[PDB]
Nucleic acid binder design. Structure first.
Ligand SMILES: [Zn+2]
Lengths: 101, 55, 104, 95, 225
RNA sequence: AGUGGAGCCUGCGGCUUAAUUUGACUCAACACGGGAAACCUCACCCGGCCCGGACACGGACAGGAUUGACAGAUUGAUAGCUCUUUCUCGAUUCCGUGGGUGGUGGUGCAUGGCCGUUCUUAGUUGGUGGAGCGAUUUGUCUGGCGAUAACGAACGAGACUCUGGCAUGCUAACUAGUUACGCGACCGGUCGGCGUAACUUCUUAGAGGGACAAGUGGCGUUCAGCCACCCGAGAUUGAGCAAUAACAGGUCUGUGAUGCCCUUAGAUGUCCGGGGCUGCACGCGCGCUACACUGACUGGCUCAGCGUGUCCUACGCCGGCAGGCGCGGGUAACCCGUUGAACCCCAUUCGUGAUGGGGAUCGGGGAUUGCAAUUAUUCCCC
C-alpha cells in the first residue's frame, strides 16, 4: 500500500500549520517514512466591488481577497493508520481531503 | 394565462435567468466562483463568508 | 492606567499556579433579568387622598425622593442635543428648581 | 386548484412540521413532493391561506419560506386527514 | 466528481451565512449571538451561541427539533448529518452582536432611547470591556432625524488592531414611525490566555519589566556548591 | 504626455417620437447607477391574458357552486379570450361587505444602512495643579542657551496589517526543478529527448533574521536639518484601515430594511407579443484611431506576469479566413501551459503627395451565438 496522499487545506496558516505539525508528529512517533509537507501555492481570490450602492461618488473601489493555502503531505503505509492519525487532530476551519493510491 | 403561454419564453440565458441568491435582483450580480450574490448584498456578507480587505 | 507604555511587575510575583481561581469570574448578569435598574416602572394611579399608606410610613404625593427621581426620569426625555448622562445608575434626587432651570 | 394537490400538501406537514419553498411561480415542480406533480406555487398559496388562519409560522430567509406547526394547528390536520390522536408527529418522539 | 476548491470554499462560506441569517431572523428576541459550524463527515455539528438556551430549546426540546428539520430540508444534505446544540455564551456583555439585539428589544419594549442605551452602555462597561460606543440615529424627536452617541472608555478607529478588538454590530429597530439604526462597538481587552479577548497585545502597548534588584557586591566570595 | 481641432464608440442635455423610462448636474453628475439593454433585463409605449382578492361575515350553491376544453366565427397567438357547438370538473367555490397581500409607484427635503465630500486634511477631547467671586485664564509656552505655574494622558498621525526588495543559512518537494550517470539522435558539444541516484541554488511557501537616521566628514542661533563619501539588497516601495464635527450631498431603482400616501381586478400586481431605451438640425464631456521616414507593408527571430477554466482547451482531418467534425486531458503548479504576447531586434518594399499614413461612410456574399441578428449582435474577405 503505497502513495497515500493527504491534503490539508484551510483559510489561514495559524490553524493550518498548527495541525500540519500535529499530523507529521504522529507519523514520527509511529515510525513512518513520510515526506515533508509541501506547500502548493496559496491561491488568492480577488473580488473588486464598488463601494457605493448608488454610482455616485469618487468611484472608489473595494479590494476583497480570500487566500487558500494548499498543503500536501505524503505517507506510505496501510490506510488503517491514516484514519487514527487524522481523526484525532480535528481542527475547525481546516479540511482534510484524502486519497488512497 | 394557460401553461403554454404563461411561461412561453425560455428563461435559460441572459440576466433574466440570473438573480441574486439573497435579494432576487437582476442588477449588479457577481457570478465569479459561483457566488451568485448582488454587488450590494455581497458587501454585507463579505466578512461572514470571509473575504478580508488587505490592499 | 491608560498609558501605552507600561511597567510590568512580573518579577515581583511570587507564585501563581492557579491563575483562573474562581474568585474574579463572578458572572455579572442583570440586564435581561428583573434586577435591571433600567426598567419601566409600570405606573400606579395617584391616590385621590394625596398620599399612600397610613400610620407613620406615609409616602405622600410631594415626597422629595419620589419627586426627584421623577424629575430625573422626566429629564431623560429631553432633546437629543441635550447631554444627560447616567443619572439612573446612581441615585439622583433632582429638585424642582434645578429641574425647572434645566427644562427652561 | 385541484383538491388532489391540496390533500397532497397536508401529509408531509403532519409528520415533521416543516415545509420549504423557493418563491418561483415560473418553476414547475417542487423537489420534496416527489412523483406527486404539485407545483411549488400551490404549496405557497396553500400555506399562505393557513398563515392568515394562524396554522403555520412563516420565516422568510434568502428566498426560502420556512413553515411551522402551531400548537393549535396540530389538531387542524387531525380533522382533515382524520388522523387518530395516538399517532404522534416527529415533534415529540425523541427524548 | 466534485467542484473546484475555489468554488467549494466560497460555497461553504455562503452556507455559514444563510444559517446565521435564518437564526438571527428567528431568534432576535432570544439573546442570539452566533453560529459555530464544525464540519465532521459523520455529522456536521452546529453550535448555537445564545444567552438563554432554555427558550431556544423551548419546552421539552420542541423548537430545536423543528429547526433542525428545517436546516435538514433546506440545504439538501442527507438526513442524519446535522446536530444542533444550543450553548450559553461565556460573557453576554462582550459579544456586541448579542448586545446590539437586546437594546433593540428594549427599544421595541417601549423604553426611552436614552435610558435603555445607558443601561446597555453600563452593562458592557461593567462586563469587562475597555471601551465602547453605542450610536442610535433616526427619528428620535419629531420629523427631523437627529443623532445620538454614547462614548465611554477607550477606542481605536484605524489599523489592523480594530479587526480583533472592536465588535461592530449594526441592527435596525422597527418602530411605529420608522427605523433606528444601532451600532455597538465593544473594544475587547488584551486577555491573553483568557477567552474574553485576543491574547495578541495592542501593536503599540509595550510593557517593561522592573529590574530584579540584584545584590550589590560587597566582598569577593567564593562559595563551593 | 495630453484634451480642446478630424473620423468615430459611448454618456449628457435640446429636438422629434406612442415610448425615445429613470436617478445624478462645479470639483462633491456627464464609459456614473457593475447601466457593454435584440426577448428577458424593464421600470416606458401599444395590445392581449391570469388572479396569485390571504382571511372573516352575509347571500347564492349539490336537483350543481365551478374549472378546463375539440371544431367553426374572431384572434398575432394549438390566447374556452367571447359566441355557437355542448363535452368536462365535485365545493378545490362565486358575488358584495370589511381587509391583507403585491408594486423597479411617490417622498434620500420623513428614515436606517452604506457611500461620497469638507479632508487624506492635522487636528480633537479629558484628567491633575496654580490665578479669578465669576465669566474666564495658564497648560493647549516670550525670545532671538534662556525664561518656564505648570505636568501629564487618550484618539487621530505614526505603530499596525498586506504587498515589493535581501538570505548559496533552516524547513521540504513526482503536481517545480537542478546536478550527475546511463540510453538515443546529429555533427567534444545540443537536445523541453528518455529514466533513475544528489540537492533545494533557481521555482514554490513557512518560520526566523535584515534598516534603527546607519557610519564618517563639511554647512547650520552649529537646533530641526542640508551636501559629499562609505557599509549595504534596501539609508526604503505601493496600498488598506482612518479622529472630532458637519452636508437638509447620493441611494425607496439592492434587499422579505422601511413611515405615510397612491394603486389594488376595464390593476401601478403578474405573464405574453411587438417596439423603445440606440432616433437627429445642434452644443457639452470621458475615450479610441490618426495626421507618418523615430512611419507603414512583408518574412524571420522572439522574451512575461496576474488570473480564469465542466467551460478552458490540446491533438488529427476538412475549408484561405472565421468555423466544423473526430476523439483525449483538466473540478486543476498535474491539462490548455515551459502559458513560445505585443511593442522590440534583423532583412525587403514604399519616399514627403491626402501617398500604400489614416481608416470613417457605404454593396455583396460567407460562419458561429442563440426561440428570433432586419434598427448591420459579433467575426472573414473583397
Ligand atoms: Zn454580488
Amino acid at each position: 500500500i503505497h502513495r497515500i496522499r493527504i491534503t490539508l487545506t484551510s483559510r489561514n496558516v495559524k490553524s493550518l500549520e498548527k495541525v500540519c505539525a500535529d499530523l507529521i508528529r504522529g507519523a514520527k512517533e509511529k515510525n513512518l517514512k513520510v515526506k515533508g509537507p509541501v506547500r502548493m501555492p496559496t491561491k488568492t481570490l480577488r473580488i473588486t466591488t464598488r463601494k457605493t450602492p448608488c454610482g455616485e461618488g469618487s468611484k472608489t473601489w473595494d479590494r476583497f481577497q480570500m487566500r487558500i493555502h494548499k498543503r500536501l503531505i505524503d505517507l506510505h503505509s496501510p490506510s488503517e493508520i491514516v484514519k487514527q492519525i487524522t481523526s484525532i487532530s480535528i481542527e475547525p476551519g481546516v479540511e482534510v481531503e484524502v486519497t488512497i493510491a | 394565462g394557460h401553461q403554454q403561454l404563461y411561461w412561453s419564453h425560455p428563461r435559460k440565458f441572459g440576466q433574466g435567468s440570473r438573480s441574486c441568491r439573497v435579494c432576487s435582483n437582476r442588477h449588479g450580480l457577481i457570478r465569479k466562483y459561483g457566488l451568485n450574490m448582488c454587488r450590494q448584498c455581497f458587501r454585507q456578507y463579505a466578512k461572514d463568508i470571509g473575504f478580508i480587505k488587505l490592499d | 492606567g491608560d498609558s501605552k507604555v507600561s511597567i510590568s511587575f512580573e518579577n515581583y510575583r511570587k507564585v501563581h499556579p492557579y491563575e483562573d481561581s474562581d474568585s474574579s469570574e463572578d458572572e455579572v448578569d442583570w440586564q435581561d433579568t428583573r434586577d435591571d435598574p433600567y426598567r419601566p416602572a409600570k405606573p400606579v394611579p395617584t391616590p385621590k387622598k394625596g398620599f399612600i399608606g397610613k400610620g407613620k410610613d406615609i409616602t405622600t404625593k410631594h415626597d422629595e425622593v419620589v419627586c426627584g427621581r421623577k424629575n430625573t426620569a422626566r429629564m431623560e426625555n429631553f432633546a437629543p442635543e441635550f447631554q444627560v448622562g447616567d443619572g439612573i445608575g446612581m441615585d439622583l434626587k433632582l429638585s424642582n428648581h434645578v429641574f425647572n432651570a434645566l427644562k427652561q | 386548484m385541484p383538491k388532489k394537490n391540496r390533500i397532497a400538501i397536508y401529509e408531509l406537514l403532519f409528520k415533521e412540521g416543516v415545509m420549504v419553498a423557493k418563491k418561483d411561480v415560473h418553476m414547475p415542480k417542487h423537489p420534496e413532493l416527489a412523483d406527486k406533480n404539485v407545483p411549488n406555487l400551490h404549496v405557497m398559496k396553500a400555506m399562505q391561506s393557513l398563515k392568515s388562519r394562524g396554522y403555520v409560522k412563516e420565516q422568510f430567509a434568502w428566498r426560502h419560506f420556512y413553515w411551522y406547526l402551531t400548537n393549535e394547528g396540530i389538531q387542524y390536520l387531525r380533522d382533515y386527514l382524520h388522523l387518530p390522536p395516538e399517532i404522534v408527529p416527529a415533534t415529540l418522539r425523541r427524548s | 466528481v466534485q467542484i473546484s476548491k475555489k468554488r467549494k470554499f466560497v460555497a461553504d462560506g455562503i452556507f455559514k451565512a444563510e444559517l446565521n441569517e435564518f437564526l438571527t431572523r428567528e431568534l432576535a428576541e432570544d439573546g442570539y449571538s452566533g453560529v459555530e459550524v464544525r464540519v465532521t463527515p459523520t455529522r456536521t455539528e452546529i453550535i448555537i451561541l445564545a444567552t438563554r438556551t432554555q427558550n431556544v430549546l423551548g419546552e421539552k426540546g420542541r423548537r430545536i427539533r423543528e429547526l433542525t428539520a428545517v436546516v435538514q430540508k433546506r440545504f439538501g444534505f442527507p438526513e442524519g448529518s446535522v446536530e444542533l446544540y444550543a450553548e450559553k455564551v461565556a460573557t453576554r456583555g462582550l459579544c456586541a452582536i448579542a448586545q446590539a439585539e437586546s437594546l433593540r428589544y428594549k427599544l421595541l419594549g417601549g423604553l426611552a432611547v436614552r435610558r435603555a442605551c445607558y443601561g446597555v452602555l453600563r452593562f458592557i462597561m461593567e462586563s469587562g470591556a475597555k471601551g465602547c460606543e453605542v450610536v442610535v440615529s433616526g427619528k428620535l424627536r419629531g420629523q427631523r432625524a437627529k443623532s445620538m452617541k454614547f462614548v465611554d472608555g477607550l477606542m481605536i478607529h484605524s489599523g489592523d488592531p480594530v479587526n480583533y478588538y472592536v465588535d461592530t454590530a449594526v441592527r435596525h429597530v422597527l418602530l411605529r414611525q420608522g427605523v433606528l439604526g444601532i451600532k455597538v462597538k465593544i473594544m475587547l481587552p488584551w486577555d491573553p490566555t483568557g477567552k474574553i479577548g485576543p491574547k495578541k497585545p495592542l501593536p503599540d502597548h509595550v510593557s517593561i519589566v522592573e529590574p530584579k534588584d540584584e545584590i550589590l557586591p560587597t566582598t569577593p566570595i567564593s562559595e563551593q556548591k
